[PDB]
Design a binder for this molecule. Structure first.
Ligand SMILES: Cc1cn([C@H]2C[C@H](O)[C@@H](COP(=O)(O)OP(=O)(O)OP(=O)(O)O)O2)c(=O)[nH]c1=O
Ligand SMILES: Cc1cn([C@H]2C[C@H](O)[C@@H](COP(=O)(O)OP(=O)(O)OP(=O)(O)O)O2)c(=O)[nH]c1=O
Ligand SMILES: [Mg+2]
Ligand SMILES: [Mg+2]
Ligand SMILES: [Mg+2]
Lengths: 105, 694, 4
DNA sequence: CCCATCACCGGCAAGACCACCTGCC
DNA sequence: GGCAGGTGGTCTTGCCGGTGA
């Protein structure tokens, strides 16, 4: 359901994706990342049509993360036509994420 | 006897103006103040006391007040003022001697609440006045409040730039506190006989009737103060070029290491605890967290979005992108464990031990990572040399004065055993000639780097070192047990080369560290580490050397019977009943014993220190009585004293040869003075710098 | 006997 | 540490502290 | 303009280690 990005695929999957992409910069050792994971699994399903959820593990793909200045995780970057439309850091709740998306979509 | 204290516009190094002075005369029981225009009268009063064969008491006068007055007298009045050593008394020297135990005997002064924390184990006048109970308030505090009233900003030490009546008053308080300290120290029956009123005697009686330790300490402090003023001729250019070479090698090692170890993300910043989202239970397995208390999708009263990154309530782990840093021990442990290394030994705070011992032994699988471990070991040593020579706060390059010399500080009795301490910078921890870059570092310190003021020709260096000091002290104390057998055998060739061969050690330095590790109670595993083996060889070496000279055990036993009366262990500590918690030093002083297992080290390390203290005192005294003058404008100049070794600058090679012979004669004199049961010897070397004189 |  | 001892000093990493920023009242 | 909270520096400790005798 979710697109697990890689360094080589990020360009062809995020910055050129036609649609609206919500990229989650995470790490396996982070608590909040584990909290927002199920929320993403449901938001990806609810918004299937008007948005696409992608995930980039900052450990496995070290070339992409530095380019966006990750200073905290989980980092939610809403890309809109190759430009970062909105950034929100933290393990938001289903309602806080729904709000964030609806306001920027 | 008179008690005094001065105030000036700066430290000895840059003092240019005398502000005020106070003198308390025991014969009149009155205080006399001297303002800036009374400088000449003040000097006269001090010389008047010297003319009467009296005594002048200062607190740190040997190192500051006396030399400051000489410098200022020449600069402001154009007079040669030189108070003789035998007429000066220093409450700081006396305090460091009688009360060397101030890091433990100060606990209940602070637990109870009576001493301001910042003055803990301090021998300063403020500290001592607090303990005595004379503190009326700091002068710096009064100046700070006058400045906070006028709106002006305070700058470090600006309270001494100009004279004022507040400084004069605080000067009088300085003299009252110095008087209180003098009388509290003289009340110690162990050092000053109660039969004599040391505040009503001439200098000759003060030195003859008081304990020998008081005289040795004042003579040592006066000589080492002169040594500090002399400085150690330093080769600034050579160290600047070495710094350029080391920095280039560091850049290359860092380049190769960052090529091999890429950057990564790791947590940095979290102070909260991540807790379970439904139950609320803390989960301390995860890294520390930060939960924002402000933020949302929108702002407050078609509502305008809130573009700050956080949402109030949404936790997140703060992280940093980190490039490999070989100077860290966390990065090294992390990357090496990610390469297969399995840590064996840890620290009692929860962190694997990453030192040269483990690093030299770490074995991974990737050949590149294994080679990076060697780049790390080189980088760490390179960094040690760069930090000590140029970048550290106390780096040599930061301490070179206008005279091209490093005036390292020395606390004549900083160690509990009677040894001295060295700092700003520590000239007793310069890398040894047998260590990496040690020859260049040691060569940078040398008499050749000083050009004679008259002929302009570089001076020559004379280095003298006590031969097997502490082992000869051991032979002395155990001669009553072995009838002087070891004291005689010890001079059968070099003791360290004989032990090296006997123990089958690679170097003579390894034999020194082994014999001293063993003698001072090292365990089997420790002796193995020292020799580069295990606990088996440790036991072998221990029983081989302890069986050869069994009187060592008897000496240890006798020490216990004299100091300890019973003991018991609770938790990690030993609860000792002390029959007497001290050892009588060669000069009679009390030498605080910290722990029963270090009592033998206390006995031996104190004896050697006191031996060396009289040696450097007698050597200079013999040189002076031979017509030689001390100073760069004379014939010789003490440049450094490293426990049992001296480095003296000499105007000519002939003078250096005389210094070497005189140091040997002074050592034999010291041995005869305290009736040593072991012959004391020294080894001298003539040369251009420290690298060649050792 | 005692020395120290 | 079933204890080598005595010392100084360096860098890293974490807290403490402080001026000064947003955002809401 | 105050209050609460956040941000970015500077300073201070403590840990862990290396240098000498
Ligand atoms: C610095 C200075 C000290 N003094 C004298 C007078 C004071 O009683 C005494 C203060 O010594 P300080 O060197 O100022 O000692 P401190 O406690 O302020 O800080 P630290 O010990 O770390 O150095 O030295 C002067 O007369 N003029 C001066 O410029
Ligand atoms: C090197 C070393 C010395 N010391 C003490 C013992 C020594 O008597 C004193 C002087 O050290 P050194 O002068 O270096 O050695 P030494 O005097 O015993 O023998 P030599 O001069 O002939 O080379 O410092 C130790 O306690 N542990 C040590 O590791
Ligand atoms: Mg003073
Ligand atoms: Mg020696
Ligand atoms: Mg020596």
């Amino acid at each position: 359901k979710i697109i697990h990005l890689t360094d080589d695929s990020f360009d062809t999957d995020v910055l050129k994706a036609d649609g609206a992409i919500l990229v989650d910069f995470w790490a396996e050792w982070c608590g909040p990342c584990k909290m927002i994971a199920p929320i993403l699994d449901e938001i990806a399903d609810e918004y299937q049509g008007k948005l696409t959820v992608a995930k980039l593990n900052i450990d496995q793909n070290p070339g992409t993360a530095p380019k966006y200045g990750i200073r905290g995780i989980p980092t939610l970057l809403l890309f809109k036509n190759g430009e970062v439309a909105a950034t929100k850091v933290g393990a938001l709740s289903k309602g806080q994420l729904k709000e964030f998306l609806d306001a920027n979509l | 006897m008179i008690v005094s204290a001065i105030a000036a516009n700066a430290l000895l190094e840059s003092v240019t103006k005398f502000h005020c002075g106070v003198i308390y005369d025991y014969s009149t029981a009155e205080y006399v103040s001297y303002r800036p225009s009374d400088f000449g009268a003040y000097l006269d009063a001090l010389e008047a006391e010297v003319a009467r064969g009296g005594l002048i008491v200062f607190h740190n006068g040997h190192k500051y007040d006396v030399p400051a007055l000489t410098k200022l007298a020449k600069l402001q009045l154009n007079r040669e003022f030189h108070l003789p050593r035998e007429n000066c008394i220093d409450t700081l020297v006396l305090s460091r001697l009688i009360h060397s135990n101030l890091k433990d005997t100060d606990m209940g002064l602070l637990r109870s609440g009576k001493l301001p924390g910042k003055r803990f184990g301090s021998h300063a006048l403020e500290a001592w006045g607090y303990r005595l109970g004379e503190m009326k308030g700091e002068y710096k505090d009064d100046f700070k409040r006058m400045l906070e009233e006028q709106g002006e900003e305070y700058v470090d030490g600006m309270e001494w730039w100009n004279f004022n009546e507040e400084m004069m008053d605080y000067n009088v308080q300085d003299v009252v506190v110095t008087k209180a300290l003098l009388e509290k120290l003289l009340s110690d029956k162990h050092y000053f006989p109660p039969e004599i009123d040391f505040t009503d005697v001439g200098y000759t009686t003060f030195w003859s009737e008081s304990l020998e330790a008081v005289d040795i300490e004042h003579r040592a402090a006066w000589l080492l103060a002169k040594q500090e003023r002399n400085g150690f001729p330093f080769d600034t250019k050579a160290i600047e070029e070495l710094y350029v070479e080391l920095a280039a090698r560091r850049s290359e090692l860092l380049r190769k290491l960052t090529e091999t170890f890429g950057s990564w993300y790791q947590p940095k910043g979290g102070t909260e605890m991540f807790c379970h989202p439904r139950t609320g239970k803390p989960l301390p397995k995860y890294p520390r967290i930060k939960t924002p208390k402000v933020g949302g999708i929108f702002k407050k009263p078609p509502c305008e979005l809130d573009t700050r990154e956080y949402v109030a309530g949404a936790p997140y782990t703060p992280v940093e992108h980190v490039v490999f840093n070989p100077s860290s021990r966390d990065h090294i442990q992390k990357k090496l464990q990610e390469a297969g290394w399995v840590p064996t030994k840890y620290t009692d705070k929860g962190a694997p031990v990453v030192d040269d011992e483990v690093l030299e032994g770490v074995r991974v699988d990737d050949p590149e990572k294994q080679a990076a471990i060697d780049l790390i070991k080189e980088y760490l040593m390179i960094q040690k040399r760069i930090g000590q020579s140029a970048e550290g706060d106390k780096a040599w390059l930061r301490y070179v004065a206008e005279d091209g010399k490093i005036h390292g500080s020395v606390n004549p009795n900083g160690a509990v055993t009677g040894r001295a301490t060295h700092a700003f910078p520590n000239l007793a921890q310069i890398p040894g000639v047998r260590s990496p870059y040690g020859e260049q570092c040691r060569a940078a310190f040398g008499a050749e780097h000083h050009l004679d003021g008259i002929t302009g020709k570089p001076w020559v260096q004379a280095g003298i070192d006590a031969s097997g000091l502490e082992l000869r002290c051991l032979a002395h104390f155990m001669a009553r047990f072995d009838n002087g057998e070891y004291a005689h055998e010890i001079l059968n060739g070099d003791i360290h080369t004989k032990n090296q061969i006997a123990a089958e050690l690679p170097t003579r330095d390894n034999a020194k560290t082994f014999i001293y590790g063993f003698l001072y109670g090292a365990g089997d595993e420790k002796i193995g580490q020292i020799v580069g083996a295990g606990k088996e060889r440790g036991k072998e070496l221990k029983k081989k050397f302890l069986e050869n000279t069994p009187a060592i055990a008897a000496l240890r036993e006798s020490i216990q019977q004299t100091l300890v009366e019973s003991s018991q262990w609770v938790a990690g500590e030993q609860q000792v009943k002390w029959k007497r918690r001290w050892i009588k030093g060669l000069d009679g002083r009390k030498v605080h014993v910290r722990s029963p297992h270090a009592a033998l080290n206390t006995l031996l390390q104190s004896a050697g220190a006191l031996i060396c203290k009289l040696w450097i005192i007698k050597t200079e005294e013999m040189l002076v009585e031979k017509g030689l003058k001390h100073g760069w404008d004379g014939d010789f100049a003490y440049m450094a004293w490293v426990h049992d070794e001296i480095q003296v600058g000499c105007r000519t090679e002939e003078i250096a040869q005389v210094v070497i012979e005189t140091a040997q004669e002074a050592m034999r004199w010291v041995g005869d003075h305290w009736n040593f049961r072991c012959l004391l010897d020294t080894e001298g070397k003539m040369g251009p710098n420290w690298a060649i004189c050792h | 006997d005692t020395d120290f």
